Amino acid sequence: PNLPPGFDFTDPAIYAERLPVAEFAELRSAAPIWWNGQDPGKGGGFHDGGFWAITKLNDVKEISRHSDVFSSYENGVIPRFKNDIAREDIEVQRFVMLNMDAPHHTRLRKIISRGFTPRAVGRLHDELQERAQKIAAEAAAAGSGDFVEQVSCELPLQAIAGLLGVPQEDRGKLFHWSNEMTGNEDPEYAHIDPKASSAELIGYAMKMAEEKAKNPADDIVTQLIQADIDGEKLSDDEFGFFVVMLAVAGNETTRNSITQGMMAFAEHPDQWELYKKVRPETAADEIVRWATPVTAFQRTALRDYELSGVQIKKGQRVVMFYRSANFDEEVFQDPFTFNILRNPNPHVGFGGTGAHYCIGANLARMTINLIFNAVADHMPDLKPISAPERLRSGWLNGIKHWQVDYT
Ligand code: HEM
Incomplete structure (x- = not known):
């Protein structure tokens, strides 16, 4: 393929400036599964010499489905x-469910699903609606400012807090810890210590579990720590690692979908007009496809495996570029058209279907629909003031800041 020498699709230096859309498109055309060699010292923590770049949606699906071969545990799923x-x-990432394989994963996911039933998530609708409206009204009253801070940041965190029944008086500290827990190499956050924030949150969560045991109530936390018919339940540390996981799975991901959804609307005025008029809930999936907040997660081959004619060898990493897959010309009609009515919308923003498929997907969609209804209600004519500031990360597609005028 036509790429520069030394080009690495996990290079945080790229993502600090841009998404490598042309480069992904080149791979889908010329080399859809491609060895991304990495120079000595430049492995993002992996000293194996590189990985297979996976760029087509059907290959992402196949890897995700064949979790018996393609392991999350062996090297974790963060590729950089x-x-x-x-x-x-x-x-240490193996302590959370995202980086576990069956059978351990299977047990935990069955327990944790208690928190993500349609009923459990539905119970959060009304409080998240009220919150979304307030957030939007407060931002509008400010006149202008940082869209990320004023509009994108709070609702995902309030969704996590509501799910867990975190007391109001504890949310400030919980949000502070959660916002320091996703590693990046951005100079703006070089002083932050994810390890310390994580140890603090796990302490808080474990205390919550021990209290809930003594004082069972009708809530999600009680359901998670009380034995089911099979005696299955989260131990206190497991509850701690569940909360730590949510702090990093359900926070910057939804936040970045909201910021990039609004960026897409700013760039596609006809879609914004349509949105304001009909408020189509299909918008959430097109926003997730367009935003692809997780650019890539990896797996490791536990045995040799032939993937679309390429021999993947035992021990090798494959990196699923959801950012490429979500613009796969073979799956989507006009992938580079932002169409809030796209239906069906079989994007892999929440992963390929399989064992690890995003457990929060419907919570994320509801969050997105609620905040954009609020933005429509309170700041229908908002316009950007300056360009977004992207996050320096090799796997998270982040916007740190974006100055906008709500009037
Ligand atoms: C737009 C926002 C979101 C995006 C783009 C996103 C994306 C993802 C992706 C790509 C995965 C891995 C899927 C795989 O490997 O097949 C995942 C897993 C997960 N997500 Fe989400 N997510 C979002 C929101 C949320 C929310 C709101 C929560 C909960 C509050 C959540 C909780 C989880 C958990 C617990 C897992 C691990 C599941 C497992 O390993 O079994 N996510 N997400």
């Missing part, structure tokens, strides 16, 4: 850390 991260700090 600081180049000099200790192996121990990669392996």
Whole structure:
């Protein structure tokens, strides 16, 4: 393929400036599964010499489905850390469900599903609606400011807090910890210590579990820590690792969908007009497809496997570029058209279907629909003041800041 020498699709230096859309498109055309070699010292924590770049949606689906072969546990699913991260700090990720394989994953996911039933998520609708409206009214009253801080940031965190029944008086500290827990190599956050924030949140969560045991109530936390028919339940530490996971799975992901959804609307005025008029809930999936907040997650081959004619060898990493897959010309009609009515919309923003498919997908969609209804209600004529500031990360597609005029 026509790419520069030394080009690495996980290079945070790229994402600090842009999404490598042309480069992904080149791979889908010329080399849809392509060895992305990595130079000595430049492995983002992985010292294996590179990985297979996976760029087509059907290949992402196949990997995701064949979790018996393609492991989350072996190397974790984050494909890029600081180049000099200790192996121990990669392996500690195995304490959360995202980086577990069956049978351990299977047990935990069955327990955790208690928190993500249609009924459980539905119970959050009304409070998240009220919150969304307030957030939007407060931003409008400010006149202008940072859209990320004023509009995108709070609702995802309030969704997590509502799900867990976190007391109001505890939400400030919970949000502070949660906003420091996703690693990046952005100079703006170089002083932050994810390890400390994570240890604090796990302490808080474990205390919550021990209290809920003594004082059972009708809520999600009680359901998680009380034995089901099979005696299955989260132990306190497992509850702690569940909360830590949510702090990093359900926070910057939804936040970035909201910011980039609004960026797409700013760029596509006809779609924004249509949105304001009919408020189509299909908008949430097109926003997730367009935003692809997780650019890539990886897996490791536990055995040799032939994927679309390419021999993947035992021990090798495959990196699923959801950002490429979501613009796959073979799956979508006019992928580079932003169409809030797209239906069906079989995007892989929430992963390929399979064992690890995003458990929060419907919570995320509801969050997105509620905040954009609020933005429509309170700031229908908002316009950007300056360009978004992107996050320096090799796997998260983030917007740090974006100045907008709500009037
Ligand atoms: C637009 C926002 C979101 C995006 C783009 C997103 C994306 C993803 C992706 C790509 C995965 C991995 C899927 C796979 O490997 O097949 C995932 C897993 C997960 N997500 Fe989401 N997510 C979002 C919102 C949320 C929310 C709001 C929550 C809960 C509050 C959540 C909780 C989880 C959890 C717990 C997992 C791990 C599931 C497992 O390993 O079994 N996510 N998400």
